[PDB]
Amino acid sequence: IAPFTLALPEGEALPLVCDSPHSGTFYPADFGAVVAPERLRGGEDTHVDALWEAVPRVGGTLLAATFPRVYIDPNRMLDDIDPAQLEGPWPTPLAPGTGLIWSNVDAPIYDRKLTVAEVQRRINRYYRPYHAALTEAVEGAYQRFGAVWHLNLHSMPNNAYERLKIQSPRPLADFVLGDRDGTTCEPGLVDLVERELREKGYTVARNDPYKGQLIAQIGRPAERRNSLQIEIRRPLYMEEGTRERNEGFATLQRDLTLLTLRIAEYVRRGV
């Protein structure tokens, strides 16, 4: 019933703070959707938190959502709501891009408009705790170390280009690294992650199709605060229909453990 898990290091801590906002699979009773949960499981970045289990084993902190992102999405801003999805007016200005509250799975989730009150309660019970935990980890790290490296962790469907409105002359990479075109993370870490993953045989794209807003807010490298969004092509570890770990899960998790150890070393040397 806890809105997040928070895996802390057993030994020496380092300022590597990692969050998996989309891996939650515990659906609230008060969802009130008209669509079968089997249809909603779509937008889950399933198992992404288990893929990165090494993080606390190497001194990092791993935060993960237990609620589904299709219920409320912690990687969106609180004003990323379309007025037309609400029954009634929102008390403050909205700036949709939408979203924070999913409205459909395909071009519908509900047979009605959500109340202001209902969305507010989602925000209080699930989003705010999750984000307070992320803040506490990021600011705690920075306060002790004078730097922080934040990884925002995801997976993506094979047709991510189709689902976004993009026609790419290139295939979708195995890993996409978003740092808002080179502005939210100091370059040496993006270079490290890219090189280590390509050496293990994975394809890596930067900022294509995912460039990273939370990431712009956390990642200000001139203040020694760094943020990188990392996206994993789902077929690499699960079966997109059943959502179930496949034969690639084990090997990918192993590769990410080894990558994480390398990042921990890079972080310790950067403090």
The reply, when asked if residue 45 is annotated as ligand binding, is: yes
Q: Report phi then psi at 164, rounded to 5.
A: -80, 170
3-state DSSP assignment of residue 15: coil
The reply, when asked if residue 208 is annotated as ligand binding, is: no
Q: Nearest approach, Cβ of 177 to Zn ion (angstroms)? A: 14
- How far apart, in whole angstroms, are the C-alpha atoms of residue 166 and residue 211? 14
Q: Nearest approach, Cβ of 153 to Zn ion (angstroms)? A: 8
Query: x/- site string to Zn ion, residues 13 to 52, per CB under 5 A?
Result: ---------x----------------------x-------
Q: Nearest approach, Cβ of 12 to Zn ion (angstroms)? A: 30
Beta-sheet pairing, 175-178 with 225-233: antiparallel
- How far apart, in whole angstroms, are the C-alpha atoms of residue 260 and residue 4? 22
Query: x/- site string to Zn ion, residues 128 to 167, per CB under 5 A?
Result: --------------------------x-------------
The enclosing H or E element of 216 equals helix 214-218
Angle CA(197)–CA(23)–CA(36) in degrees, nearest 5? Answer: 130
The reply, when asked if residue 22 is annotated as ligand binding, is: yes
Residues touching Zn ion: how many (CB under 5 A)?
3
Task: At 160, list the tokens.
Answer: 């991510």
Q: Nearest approach, Cβ of 167 to Zn ion (angstroms)? A: 22
- How far apart, in whole angstroms, are the C-alpha atoms of residue 204 and residue 193? 9
Annotated binding-site ranges? 22, 45, 154
Annotated binding-site ranges for Zn(2+)? 22, 45, 154
**Contact positions toward Zn ion, by CB under 5 A?**
22, 45, 154
